[PDB]
Design an enzyme around this catalytic site. Structure first.
Site, short mmCIF file in Angstrom:
data_model
loop_
_atom_site.label_atom_id
_atom_site.label_comp_id
_atom_site.label_asym_id
_atom_site.label_seq_id
_atom_site.Cartn_x
_atom_site.Cartn_y
_atom_site.Cartn_z
N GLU A 46 24.59 69.87 45.71
CA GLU A 46 24.53 70.21 47.02
C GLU A 46 24.18 68.81 47.80
O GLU A 46 23.05 68.11 47.43
CB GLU A 46 23.39 71.30 47.31
CG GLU A 46 23.81 72.58 47.44
CD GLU A 46 22.61 73.56 48.17
OE1 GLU A 46 21.82 73.80 47.20
OE2 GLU A 46 22.81 74.14 49.13
N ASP A 150 36.97 60.80 38.31
CA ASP A 150 37.11 61.86 39.23
C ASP A 150 37.83 61.25 40.66
O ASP A 150 37.15 61.32 41.61
CB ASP A 150 36.11 62.66 39.58
CG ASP A 150 36.22 64.04 40.27
OD1 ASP A 150 37.23 64.34 40.13
OD2 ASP A 150 35.01 64.54 40.84
#
Ligand code: MNX
EC number: 2.7.11.1
Length: 327
Positions: A46, A150
């Site tokens: 988060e 990524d």
């Protein structure tokens, strides 16, 4: 298979550099940082924008929702080793998150402008410029024995006003060790390299160059994502429909890889589709012979055939970017 460059980086460095599991965090104090609002979320994180209570500057607070601790130390260790590198996000502090027993990474603040709105406005030159900046970050982390794993628009934050770029989210990054077999469930589907899709586990830094190629293709052709598969198997099909199965075949043969029966049937057989076939009225202003040549050298099935980040930076496509820089 082994990396053509920086293969012995972690071989030459102290075990303490790459042995992230032996890392012991110096937990800072959580009250030192105050959350001001949510900004997004990774796969297991988060992210919020905050403020340092002590010196009042802006910061980024990334709460690592339950990831796995082994994975938390890895990201911290990698960020610590890369701090200072060109265009790499900087880890400022590490604390504990009250609501949870989740570590929380504090980064220097990065203003980003959503790529979905930014990209459509970039000029031919802007794309050359930003890709070059991203390349600086990749050649740097590769030179330090680390693969990002990524690379995608979402992990490349750009402040278009100040023309600044930062490579973020090193949660899937890893240390490269010659001959080691890694997990293939890394990267995001649309940016997964052929090696991840055919189960070639002893991959290397070159994986990031494929993902870069995917991002670049989407940018110059104004088609995002460029390879739009609906699952990993279909992802390989989408790639084969463009690069052709002839090259796929040479690749599988070279590395003694046997596609499972299911996947082999899905892939079928396809002839190569010329890059120019992707040009249209919407992307004509971005598709040039140099752009296509650069792209062609990134999107190769054989990871060993792809340009290294250092080679990529010297491509004539970026000649004006370098010229301007040498002043
Ligand atoms: O993972 C990150 C991240 C994410 O997963 C989803 C959305 C925004 C993010 O921002 C980050 C920033 N940032 O915005 O400065 C710095 C380091 C990071 O690891 C991240």
């Amino acid at each position: 298979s082994k990396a053509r460059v920086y293969a012995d980086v972690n071989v030459l460095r102290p075990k303490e550099y790459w042995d992230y599991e032996a890392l012991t965090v110096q937990w800072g104090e959580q009250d030192d940082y105050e959350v001001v609002r949510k900004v997004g979320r990774g796969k297991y994180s988060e992210v919020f924008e905050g403020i340092n209570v002590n010196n009042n500057e802006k910061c980024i607070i990334k709460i690592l929702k339950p990831v796995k601790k082994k994975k938390i130390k890895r990201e911290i260790k990698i960020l610590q080793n890369l701090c200072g590198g060109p265009n790499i996000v900087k880890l400022l502090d590490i604390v504990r998150d009250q609501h949870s027993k989740t570590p929380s990474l504090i980064f220097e603040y990065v203003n980003n402008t959503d790529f979905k709105v930014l990209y459509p406005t970039l000029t031919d030159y802007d794309i050359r410029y930003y890709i070059y900046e991203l390349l600086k970050a990749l050649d740097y982390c590769h030179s330090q024995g680390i693969m990002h794993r990524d690379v995608k628009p979402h992990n490349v934050m750009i402040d278009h006003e100040l023309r600044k770029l930062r490579l973020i989210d090193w949660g899937l990054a890893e240390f490269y060790h010659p001959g080691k077999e890694y997990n293939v469930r890394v990267a995001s589907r649309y940016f997964k390299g052929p090696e991840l899709l055919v189960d070639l586990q002893d991959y290397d830094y070159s994986l990031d160059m494929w993902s870069l190629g995917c991002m670049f293709a989407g940018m110059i052709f104004r088609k995002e994502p460029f390879f739009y598969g609906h699952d990993n198997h279909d992802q390989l099909v989408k790639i084969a429909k463009v690069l052709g199965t002839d090259g796929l075949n040479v690749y599988l043969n070279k590395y003694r890889i046997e596609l499972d029966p299911q996947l082999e049937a899905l892939v079928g057989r396809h002839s190569r589709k010329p890059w120019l076939k992707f040009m249209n009225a919407d992307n004509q202003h971005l598709v040039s012979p140099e752009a296509i040549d650069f792209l062609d050298k990134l999107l190769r099935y054989d990871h060993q055939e792809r340009l290294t980040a250092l080679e990529a930076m010297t491509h004539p496509y970026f000649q004006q970017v370098r010229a301007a820089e040498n002043s």
